[PDB]
Symmetry: D2
Subunit: 254 residues, 4 copies
């Protein structure tokens, strides 16, 4: 039990030769996770449901940076798509080392106005979808693999009105991480959740206020702020971090 | 702002003349919530989905203790039932002061073995169902009302293997409570979650180990242990408690 | 099977504090005074501890007696462990037993971390943290089997946007961990240990430092402060009062709180700080 | 728009600590020594603080130099605020600047709450809590704009089943609140403040009190202890090592940790305590 796990020094942060799959990587945070993982030496499978041109654009940009990439279409709201996606994925690069479950949708509304269709739309993607991406990831990941789920500051936020559906769909992910860390540990896979505060993306648009209001550091959160933490968790540096929820919001209070 | 909210002294704990609706009150924890609320002076609407004979038995026992009660059949997995249930409910006693969302199902399985049907079965009742019972409760509750949702120690537990689905369905409730407390506060309704540890019920069966293992107090948790906290929250004593998660597990660590 | 035994009475009596003896530290003023009054109103005999406010302490004692319950004041400085030990010995000799201990005494403190002196850090922690721990140590020793220990925390223990409050906040955050750990130890006597964590509450502490939680509120009128506390710290749109806290303390102090141990109950009207 | 500016380098360089100067308290042994070594391995110049282990401190300093990075030891007792101030002044005069401060020094303590003495409580809090706060105060003052402050917590800050550990656990729990509050204050210099909360880690502290976290483990062999720690505290089935902690500290210390502030990162292999 004294045996050092992995390399001492900077190489422990290396993602060289790893293969990562990121869901919803054609745009926003998912796109930057893919770009950054690629820059650190990973071959990346860029999943998308709709944004096809965007997806091929991410794949091309990743190749331009020196790493192989490919895209796979799949809607996480359909478990059959998720199963197919992983089967396709492992055949592209031969194995899967890292899985970043990032696909998600936003929603707003006073609880009184929430319809079952809106609730179902959000939970099927943000919660159910991530659960099943996690199930398939467990099956296909290399022993010693990595699974990073997507949460949000709203999972624990205390002052966000008209956001019960969205927040609740994200809060659930935090418990999944704790519970899946136990189950998936039998293949030495760590399972963690990244919980971004506000981050500039299309979802975000739906700067000075965000800068001064949600951060003492006085700036806006960017996709790269999240991508960097994902790479840490995905590396050997994140080896003793499992079942945790990492808040990435610049010291926000919401 | 110096005006005292409600009566000073013991009367602040009184539930005399209140009308409460409890979901899944024909058995287990829900049955005891109904009995105890009744003993404290509440008229109780006993909801059930299947246990009809059990439901009428709870209603009869509550009457025998000195309070009026009635039962209403409704499956929380069907939002149409929930809407109907509340419409029926308010017509029985004329108003609704307290709503205890308690209906829930248990589930077990290593993440790898979870099917979409099992995941959906559990989330539709434990999460989606409670959300919609909450939505209708908001609509029908008296200004100054009370909404108590049902959680679990598993929402935050760290060592329960093969329980991602169940735990996650409960963890979501904790975020709902925080978010609904904001929305529902416009009618002065407090929203909280009770999170029981192991409690002796039918679900439980699925004593010395539970006694010594999950509690320094060295005994098993009972439905009344939960019912009592529910009554506190439901009373004027719980007036400044909103958006909170109250753990009721005798000091357990799971 | 023997575990099927119902702990305590079924029904409203489970919330009764009749014939209970409680001790409240810092009960001459603020939240502590109201805890004492409310506990007295629900049937408890109360030992009203105070360190300085003698006249106020006797006023609370007289008021509690007027409401129909016995009371007595005991002077003790929580920053001196010898005083606490002496206080508990005097307490059990006044009423014979101790069923409930409410550790409430505390001081507030403001200042950017860069400006904190070892003397200021020491002053706050000696009362808020060290003091509560030894009041707890003694409460464990003297409490009845099946007793109750309620510690005083604060929303600041978990708050994320309170600047210039590291010392005070940290002194209350420590209490949350004490509750979890002491709940284990004290359970060998069936004592439950919990923390009440209030948000802003109208008391002398409130008035003094209230403006220090409000961005550019140093020039706020008292009404603009109350109004700011009402709308800003609570969806319920009102200010927190000592009675809001006293009521939860009584719940925890009663048989209703029997399965509640090692917990932190936030009492802030749904505040985000 | 100006907020679209990317903070730091894109790619692997963002994890680089090249040309950084770090100070680690209690770096002569245990987790602190490894933090120093690993920081040194990633390109940092390190000030190895120690209070007693002089020979060990110079050994760490020599080892760091052998790995190709400069280092120097500074003696200071964290329980004495004057020592900490002097330590920071000496530190910035050795390497010219300070980019990273790792507050690691700490002592362990065991005992049922009833048996805790004011001297034992004071000994632990003066080093674990008071000491870390003043190392933090000074780190704020001397750190570069955009610096890093990593405080040492523990799984015990939130643990729910550790008996006879209220003093130690409480001293670490306070650190979690300090991080949230200091992150606000220290942000005016763009400094991020976080806490690393390890589970059981093989060091001298580990060996001594390990058996005190294991029910009836007082008669366990060293192997049965390691084996118990392996299976009992981690689904990953292995014991935690100083390097497991050092790696996370380096992440936080780098540009990768730029948006991570006011957080507590648990590093326990998924333990439940
Ligand atoms: N940006 C923010 O402020 C925060 C975001 N988050 C979470 O981070 C994640 C990324 O957010 P962000 O990048 O801002 O989002 P955007 O709205 O910019 O796009 C997010 C991604 O979700 C994908 N997606 C949606 N539905 C599906 C689906 N059914 N199957 C597969 N992929 C799908 C989209 O792909 P496609 O184009 O193919 O539809 C898109 O790639 C989300 O889960 C979000 O909830 C959390 C906190 C804050
Ligand atoms: N007992 C324990 O250890 C713990 C329980 N809990 C939660 O507390 C609640 C009560 O648990 P417990 O009493 O032990 O459970 P039981 O299994 O004894 O029965 C729970 C209740 O759920 C009701 N129910 C199930 N489905 C529905 C539905 N579709 N619509 C309406 N009611 C429904 C059942 O009614 P019916 O007969 O009509 O089907 C029953 O009344 C649950 O939500 C549970 O998850 C949380 C932590 C611990
Ligand atoms: N007001 C608020 O908004 C909040 C208050 N709290 C906590 O609640 C507790 C009481 O607060 P509050 O009533 O507002 O405070 P006040 O400022 O009104 O004073 C409260 C009590 O503290 C007592 N006290 C101070 N020092 C000592 C000491 N050395 N030994 C014994 N008793 C002492 C005082 O005694 P004496 O009469 O001798 O002066 C007084 O009885 C504190 O622990 C506080 O930090 C937590 C969150 C919010
Ligand atoms: N090991 C574990 O399982 C865990 C450890 N921790 C925390 O990590 C930190 C280090 O732990 P670990 O390496 O195991 O501990 P060790 O017992 O191995 O000793 C660690 C360091 O603490 C230093 N120290 C003690 N007192 C002082 C003082 N008064 N002033 C300055 N430095 C002092 C020691 O200095 P010196 O050489 O002079 O003796 C030593 O360098 C502590 O804060 C500890 O509580 C947290 C969780 C788990
Ligand atoms: O936690 C607290 O301790 C004292 C206090 C005051 Cl006096 C006020 Cl006004 C507010 Cl808002 C808060 Cl949150 C606190
Ligand atoms: O939190 C801790 O501080 C020291 C320590 C040791 Cl020395 C051991 Cl062995 C274990 Cl298991 C834990 Cl959790 C801790």
């Amino acid at each position: 039990y004294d045996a050092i796990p992995g390399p001492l020094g900077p190489q422990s942060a290396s993602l060289e030769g790893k293969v990562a799959l990121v869901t919803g990587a054609g745009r926003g945070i998912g796109r930057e996770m893919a770009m950054e993982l690629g820059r650190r030496g990973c071959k990346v499978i860029v999943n998308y449901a709709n944004s096809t041109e965007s997806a091929e654009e991410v794949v091309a940009a990743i190749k331009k940076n020196g790493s192989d990439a490919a895209c796979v279409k799949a809607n996480v709201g359909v478990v059959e798509d998720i199963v197919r996606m992983f089967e396709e994925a492992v055949k592209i690069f031969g194995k899967l080392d890292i899985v970043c479950s990032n696909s998600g949708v936003v929603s707003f509304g006073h609880v009184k106005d929430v319809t079952p269709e809106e609730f179902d739309r959000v939970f099927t993607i943000n919660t159910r979808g991530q659960f099943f991406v996690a199930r398939e990831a467990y099956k296909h990941l290399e022993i010693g693999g990595r699974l990073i789920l997507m949460g949000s500051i709203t999972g624990q936020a205390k002052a966000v009105p008209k956001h019960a559906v969205y927040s609740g769909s994200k809060g659930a992910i935090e418990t999944f991480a704790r519970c899946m860390a136990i189950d998936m540990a039998d293949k030495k896979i760590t399972v963690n959740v990244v919980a971004p505060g506000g981050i500039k993306t299309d979802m975000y648009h739906a700067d000075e206020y965000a800068a001064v209001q949600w951060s003492p550091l006085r700036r806006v959160g960017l996709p790269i702020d999240i991508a960097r933490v994902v790479c840490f968790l995905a590396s050997n540096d994140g080896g003793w971090v499992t079942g945790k929820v990492i808040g990435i919001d610049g010291g926000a209070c919401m």
